[PDB]
Design a protein around this motif. Sequence first.
Motif, short mmCIF file in Angstrom:
data_model
loop_
_atom_site.label_atom_id
_atom_site.label_comp_id
_atom_site.label_asym_id
_atom_site.label_seq_id
_atom_site.Cartn_x
_atom_site.Cartn_y
_atom_site.Cartn_z
N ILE C 12 0.84 -1.19 0.00
CA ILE C 12 0.00 0.00 0.00
C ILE C 12 0.88 1.25 0.00
O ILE C 12 2.10 1.15 0.03
CB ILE C 12 -0.97 0.02 1.20
N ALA C 13 -12.10 -0.39 4.20
CA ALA C 13 -11.18 0.33 3.33
C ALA C 13 -9.86 0.61 4.04
O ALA C 13 -8.93 1.16 3.45
CB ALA C 13 -11.81 1.62 2.84
N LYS C 14 -9.78 0.21 5.31
CA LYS C 14 -8.60 0.46 6.14
C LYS C 14 -7.84 -0.84 6.33
O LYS C 14 -8.29 -1.71 7.09
CB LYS C 14 -9.02 1.04 7.49
N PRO C 15 -6.68 -1.02 5.68
CA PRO C 15 -6.06 -2.36 5.67
C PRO C 15 -5.56 -2.82 7.02
O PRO C 15 -5.66 -4.02 7.33
CB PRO C 15 -4.92 -2.19 4.66
N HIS C 19 -9.89 -7.59 10.47
CA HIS C 19 -11.21 -7.72 9.87
C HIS C 19 -11.90 -8.97 10.37
O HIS C 19 -11.26 -9.98 10.69
CB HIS C 19 -11.11 -7.76 8.34
#
Lengths: 114, 196, 43, 158, 264, 86, 133, 160, 65, 180, 559
Positions: C12, C13-15, C19
């Motif tokens: 590199i 919605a926020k990685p 999750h």
Amino acid sequence: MNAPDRFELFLLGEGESKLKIDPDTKAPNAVVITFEKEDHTLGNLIRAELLNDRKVLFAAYKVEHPFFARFKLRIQTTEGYDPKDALKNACNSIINKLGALKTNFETEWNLQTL
Amino acid sequence: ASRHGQKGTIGITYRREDMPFTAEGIVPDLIINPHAIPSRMTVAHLIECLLSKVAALSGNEGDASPFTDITVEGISKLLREHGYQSRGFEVMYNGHTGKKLMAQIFFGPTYYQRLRHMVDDKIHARARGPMQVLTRQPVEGRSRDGGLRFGEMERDCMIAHGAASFLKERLMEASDAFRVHICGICGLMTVIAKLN
Amino acid sequence: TLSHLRRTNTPIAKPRQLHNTHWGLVCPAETPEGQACGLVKNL
Amino acid sequence: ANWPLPVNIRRIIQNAQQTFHIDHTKPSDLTIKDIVLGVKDLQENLLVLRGKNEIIQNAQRDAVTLFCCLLRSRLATRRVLQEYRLTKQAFDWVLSNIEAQFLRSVVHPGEMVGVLAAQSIGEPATQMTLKKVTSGVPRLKEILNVAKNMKTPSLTVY
Amino acid sequence: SEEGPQVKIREASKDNVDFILSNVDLAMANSLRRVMIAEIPTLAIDSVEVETNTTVLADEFIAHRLGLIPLQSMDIEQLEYSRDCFCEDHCDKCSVVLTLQAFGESESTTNVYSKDLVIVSNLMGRNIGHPIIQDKEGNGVLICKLRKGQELKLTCVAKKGIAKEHAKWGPAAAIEFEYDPWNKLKHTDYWYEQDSAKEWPQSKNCEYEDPPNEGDPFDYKAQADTFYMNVESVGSIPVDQVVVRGIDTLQKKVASILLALTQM
Amino acid sequence: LKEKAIPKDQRATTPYMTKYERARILGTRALQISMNAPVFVDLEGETDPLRIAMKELAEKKIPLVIRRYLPDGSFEDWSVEELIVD
Amino acid sequence: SNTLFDDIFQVSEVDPGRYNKVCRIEAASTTQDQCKLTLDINVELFPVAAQDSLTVTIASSLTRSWRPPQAGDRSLADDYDYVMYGTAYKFEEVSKDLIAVYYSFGGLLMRLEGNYRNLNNLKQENAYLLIRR
Amino acid sequence: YDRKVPSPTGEYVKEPEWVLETDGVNLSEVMTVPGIDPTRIYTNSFIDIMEVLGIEAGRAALYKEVYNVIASDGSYVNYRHMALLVDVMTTQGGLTSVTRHGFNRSNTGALMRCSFEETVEILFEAGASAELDDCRGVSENVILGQMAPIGTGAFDVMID
Amino acid sequence: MIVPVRCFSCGKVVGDKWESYLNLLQEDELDEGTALSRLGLKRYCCRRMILTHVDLIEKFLRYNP
Amino acid sequence: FIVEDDGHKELKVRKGHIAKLMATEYQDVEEYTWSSLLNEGLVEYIDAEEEESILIAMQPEDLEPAELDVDPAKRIRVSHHATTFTHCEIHPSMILGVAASIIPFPDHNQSPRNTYQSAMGKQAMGVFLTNYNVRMDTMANILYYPQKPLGTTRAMEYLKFRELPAGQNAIVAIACYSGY
Amino acid sequence: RGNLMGKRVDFSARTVISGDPNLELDQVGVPKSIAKTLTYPEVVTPYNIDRLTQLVRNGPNEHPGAKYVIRDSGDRIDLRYSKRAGDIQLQYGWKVERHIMDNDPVLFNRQPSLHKMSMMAHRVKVIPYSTFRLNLSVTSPYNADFDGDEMNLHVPQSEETRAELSQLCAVPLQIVSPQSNKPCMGIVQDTLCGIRKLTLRDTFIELDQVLNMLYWVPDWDGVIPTPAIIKPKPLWSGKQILSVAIPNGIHLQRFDEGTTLLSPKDNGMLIIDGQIIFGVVEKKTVGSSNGGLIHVVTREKGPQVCAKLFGNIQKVVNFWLLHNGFSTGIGDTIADGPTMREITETIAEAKKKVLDVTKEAQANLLTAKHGMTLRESFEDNVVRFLNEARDKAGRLAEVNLKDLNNVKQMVMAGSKGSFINIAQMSACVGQQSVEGKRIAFGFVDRTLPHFSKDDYSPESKGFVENSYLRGLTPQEFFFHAMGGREGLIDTAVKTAETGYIQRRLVKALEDIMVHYDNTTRNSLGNVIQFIYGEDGMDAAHIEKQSLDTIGGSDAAFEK
RNA sequence: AUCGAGAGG
Ligand SMILES: Nc1ncnc2c1ncn2[C@@H]1O[C@H](COP(=O)(O)CP(=O)(O)OP(=O)(O)O)[C@@H](O)[C@H]1O
Ligand SMILES: [Mg+2]
Ligand SMILES: [Zn+2]
Ligand SMILES: [Zn+2]
Ligand SMILES: [Zn+2]
């Protein structure tokens, strides 16, 4: 690396008196002794036996730093009484107690069967 | 360090006679300050002490598996069956004096791990040392006998103190000092000066 | 050695945030600190 | 009431009754006139800018106005005799000690006020860590850089 | 017997001796424990030179193990510290030299025990340096295992030493102390969620002293003179000799203080 | 440029010595003491130049004048003896 | 160099709060309404019976370093079971012609109010409290 | 909101007050609206306050919100530091941000300017306009290595 | 890698027991705790050296070079 | 694992299958392996997108029919109040990674501390391989007397940490002392 | 940016740091090898020349020694290798690069250099082991800790530089910080925990321990305080032994809600002439605060006396605590069974209230407030319910906690711990928060694949009913992991942002300083402020003082 | 030196 050799803590060094005696400033009949190359083992007995004696007013010992082994003993006594005499009397009484106990326990061990 | 994130550097080493001793004579291999624990909130360290003592006494390996129904009360019941106090708190005696400690002290077996970061391997110092040629400044790294960087934040920390001459000495005489000749009309280093 | 063998990198919605989809597939806590947190995780 | 002020007058008062042993029964030897005159003289004494010109004098008066208010509050003539059994020597020592502490409390010229202020703001900002209003380091960034858009613009009307 | 402290020994073994110490200030017993742990001197390998090593274990590891190996030290008093002797490196009077050589002649692994070590230096008719074996089988403590084709050969110089210099010379393993088991002196404050008596375990030694009575007030003046102790010997020196030698070491320290004072 | 100095009369700089200027004076005096420059106070068991400089400050014998600048360029001069140290 | 105050007080109630060694004691001067005293005591050192009546004394004396009690060489200042040393921080009046004395003996607080003695118990560093069974 | 007000007797009293909060700000129209107190209005945005009222009012509001971000974490900073920064922004023209453009538009010495950001461009513009730097700035003397006129260095020392 | 000579805390020799200890658990199907009790290792400090240690020496022996 | 109808919904895997798997474990008859279970259809592989349709249960015993004096110390478990699980988790510990599976009772500790410990396991001193003395490595570090941990995860068995540990079971005292 | 203002420096050092209670606050434990590597140039002077010569005869390898000698011409003389290293005769004016010897100014630095207090001058004590040793009280201004932290040290090379370091950068001067009107240094460790225990009226010292503790005080004049209780036995309160450490002629007064002059609860403090009349010492008493004990001692007596006070307090409290003992414990975390069941019924009441509120939301009976979504109001109500549940459970635990509880001791002293830590470890760890919201459905309508569709119940929402002691469930573990991961991300990005912010602030206004006219201006001359702070007064002297005129009624004002 | 990787507070 930087560590001091272990032999220093049980053995004396060059230019080191075992005992150094300096009177306490602004104190009556009080003196501090810098036992060198010694530990708590020796100091505790001296403090306790000095405290037992009535003529010894003060009895305390301290280690200025646990890193290196030295201990300071402070003694204050009655006027007309030398602190060194109190220290030696306590030492001698300690020795007598050690001898008495060793004889008694040796007799008990001989009485014991195993 | 140990599991559960406890990180420690041994500020001193104590011979066994200096250290405190339990009634059975067992002295702890290591001792850690209490105040680290409450902020980290790592109960598993305490339960590991408890279960490791239970396992050492029982001869049966302790189960540290997560998501398994293990009651602290049950392990303490086992420890009581062994004879040691349920919480693992044990009466201890100060080594220097021989007197019983007023507050009982909690010590048990615990897994600990040595770490790559070693003090003797890490220490570094530099007198007048080797200088990298391009900036005429101390080289980088302990390996090349280098000199530590005077950070800009450190520069400001000294600036607000008022140690102007200290900053001048550290930033001019201590590193890459040089003397040059400039001609008045030129205002440049072009002027070639012959000293002999 | 094993943890280096099982390594993932997210370029590199926020990685960085763990999750729900990562459950059972990615370790929840085995992530390096610093800038690598979140982007790099162990399976 | 609780505000940062210099010289810490109440401490000087406790030191006053302990340095000079105070007998509560005995009447104060201080005449009523002397307390007020000494407080006025001390107000004149606590100079913070050296110039005697009228505009720098006015700046000095304004600068020391709040401190003078506190001094008058704790040196009221009724207060001095009633709360404590002040003697003339004790009152004069309090006056001189207050003056000395105020003089010590002046900023030393040349001190880098700037970098000090910057780091004074920086230190707690690192400590700052994580409801509908912007807060924290993003809010501080918005504050620092003139922002044509605010994340949480709000207007409080009374 | 002799007026002073008195000892009543509950149990005795070559390994462990249990005893009861009476009419003693606590500081004396504690300092004796410290002397017994560390300050008593014994013999241990202070130097190892390996000529060949084909084992997987590295030489420094082995040398540390050898330093920790127990050697007989009953006659250690006749031996003298290496630093106190006039020898260039070591003297037959100050140091004891041993040799160890082993080869894994069998395809099965052959172990190395303390029975395998032998002594070169002259005994001079003193009981020093004998390998110590408490094993029922008589085999010594394991040092290394040797597969077939593995040979180790080394020479050890064993010197006198004090455990304060290194833990190897320490003659004792476990020292057991207990005073005021009923906590009549109240030198410790118990921790309890519901009841101190239920959660806390009563001491074994606690049964020998007379139980307290709640109605009787706490004696402020009281000071504990009765102590219960247990000493452990590795077998390098017998238990009774270990404690007597601690006594003598403490008295010698006191005498050295007195002698320094007389010189003063 | 010329005669930028403020006259001695009605000096407006602080009578108290700023900690920076006492620090600089002590530093310079310690430097010259380590340089074997003459010492104008008797010394009682002191070999370190900075402690000697402190003793000289207490005696107020050290001769030097601080040039205190102003933003316009005018400079006010204060002798060490005039300045008071607390 | 004499005692400042003597009286006999009976404890209304004894209540130790958050301490095992140190209790708090409440009492009033017998037969007198003006004087009442409340103070801290070490009940472990000296048990205080409930509803007990005890004699209470305050004396100025009998700096100088403390010396261990000579074994009969110096005669006891008192046969009283209990004694403490303390210093007064401030003296106030609950009302006009109504005096209150504030003391603290080694951090153990003491407060006695009464007009029966105004000159005595004067503010001073030296003060001693003697209590007999 | 509970607000402190002087009682008739002069003591503290705390009377509840209705306050309204708006998620958008158009101050110029809001203040003219009747039914509001024109003297008590406050806004999160400093720039609207500066445009509507005056630069000193904007300075005060800026310090207020800085105080808020400090006090949200419970930390306390003495007023003088925040005031110094707020006045640093406030003194010139309108409001000058702490950014590259904020410092660079200032006519300070070229080297102190080039230290922060856009180093080569700042030096280029100084060279093209033949800008003269006084070297009085601290960072400029740091680069020169000469002792800065800071604290110890500010006062000159002369012999008798 | 190999059986520790002595417990770091206890100081009592623990190596001599190991060779018997294994045989104690395999010959009589003994529990580990009862085996440690038979060895005489009453304290848990000396028990942990025997119970936690693993002989990595055996794996090291298998390499011919 | 796979859940299907039996008349209550029951785990597809049964006791005799476990006995056969354990019998094949002991020998190391016909080989019983995970491939055998997949071909038998007693287990399935689920990716992330397919998980959305499925419904899982942490503990197999939840599937058994329900119906007090529960022990107070046990952690609170919400009654599932749910049915028609397609699958049952083999064991929850499987979500944890290799470094986390070492950590003892991570469920009783805050997760950030578990993360920090997962960072330190890489720095932990340990015997990386038994071939160390034969291998030439730029930097190699090994413990003198490595010992297995006293408290072990079940997953630790498959991590081979007990066989090849990287720490010492030291006696640890929580105590105030000199102040270092 | 990095070579003109970030130059690498000669005569620098760096080491792992550990704390030494016996080491004085002013000093640092410089290792011997570091002091050997570090040289200070000293001109040979008639006062010191003897000593200097002796050092050169000891040699560079053993300290005190010297590495180099500089002639009048300046040609170097190397002590390590030279034929004249033994027969040197120092001519006057020559330079000797002496080793770093005790009582020499050095500059000690912690790596995050956001604070003036991070870079401070220390005395040097040369010590055997290789770790740098600092006082426990000096950790806080540096923000340092002994979790493996590394710190830097620098050595001045000129005499006026040494004087600048000693007269400006010395630790005692920086004891009172400009910002916060507060001291930096404080006593925050086991020392703080045990000072409270020693000051307890329950705690009583004995004659032998009294003598040892008195002797431990370095400035001890030799007075033996009169025992608080004499006739039953000579006993001393911890207050007396501590009062020996308090300097003569100091007066401190502390007022809180329960500070009666009687003070039955023993809260608050009173000290007159260095004697503690009543109270139990705590973090407010000793730890750095406006009008703190260190603040008063620094203001009146001076800085050196207060640093010595730091040392003396540490020595006394550390000896007493060493002899008394203390420990964290697992049992300190364990709470009473009945209180635990009361906490569980608290949790159940919270769950039932959430259920009923959800059921109302299902019937669409609730009416939203202005500017608020119905979903927003539902989320806020349930969030507040769970927060109240956690806090109530913690309060029940705290009332149930006894005085003997060691965590309670640490919290009461203020050394460590907080109410939230106790509550999370004891009863309930709380509801998990991600991006400022309760746990969301990463999968559609299910937070986790095990959970059912469209579940807004607290277990799915991520509220962890279980405590740390009780054991988290797997789902709760994943939720907590999400929260912790967000915390780590926030800390990393926050450190980056705060560094940038501090850099911009420092560069913006670095120039500004008070000039000799007391105006605060820049190099160009533009006046930022005519008076620094608008009063022209140093921030360290300022402390919060009450104003009596502003408050009260008119009648009381008149009276 | 350059680039890159990992790691420590
Ligand atoms: N005043 C304080 N000073 C130092 N550490 C503190 C602290 N208060 C709390 N801590 C601890 O700091 C730890 C966080 O780890 P780190 O962030 O790596 C050390 P830090 O000093 O907070 O920041 P750093 O990374 O710049 O060193 C927490 O566990 C916390 O207990
Ligand atoms: Mg740290
Ligand atoms: Zn030219
Ligand atoms: Zn010899
Ligand atoms: Zn052991």
